């Protein structure tokens, strides 16, 4: 949750409020009861932000089935070097169930987005 005029980084500052999603991860740190990987232009993550990993769970995939970020001993997502961060006056609705709404439809306050009738 980024605030208006906040320092997204020591180089640029936001103009509006709302959520500011990040673009590309150049580096991703992990935490074990902690190493760190390095993503490349052709590689991309498949796991959300700040999520715990299992013993063997695919983290950051790529075009090469070899040399990939594989799971380990209880990790945690901690992105570090984003490519860009565009902000949007949108609201965050965390869902853990099923998604009913289609990506490309206008909704109004009240209408159920997902999770049966929670979110």
UniProtKB/Swiss-Prot annotation:
Subunit details: The RNAP catalytic core consists of 2 alpha, 1 beta, 1 beta' and 1 omega subunit. When a sigma factor is associated with the core the holoenzyme is formed, which can initiate transcription.
Task performed by this protein: DNA-dependent RNA polymerase catalyzes the transcription of DNA into RNA using the four ribonucleoside triphosphates as substrates.
Family: Belongs to the RNA polymerase beta' chain family.
Name of the protein this chain belongs to: DNA-directed RNA polymerase subunit beta'
Phylogenetic placement of the source organism: Bacteria, Thermotogati, Deinococcota, Deinococci, Thermales
Residues shown, of full length: 184 to 427 of 1524
């Amino acid at each position: 949750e980024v605030v208006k005029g906040q320092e997204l980084a020591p180089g640029v500052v936001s103009r509006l409020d709302g959520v500011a999603l990040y673009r590309f991860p150049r580096r991703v740190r992990v935490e074990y009861v902690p190493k760190d990987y390095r993503v490349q232009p052709h590689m991309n993550v498949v796991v959300p932000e700040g999520a715990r990993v299992e013993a063997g769970d695919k983290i950051v995939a790529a075009i090469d089935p070899e040399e990939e970020v594989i799971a380990e001993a209880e990790g945690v997502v901690h992105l570090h070097e984003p490519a860009s961060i565009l902000v949007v006056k949108a609201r965050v609705y965390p869902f853990e169930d099923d998604v009913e709404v289609s990506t490309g439809d206008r909704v109004a306050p009240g209408d159920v987005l997902a999770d049966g009738g929670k979110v």
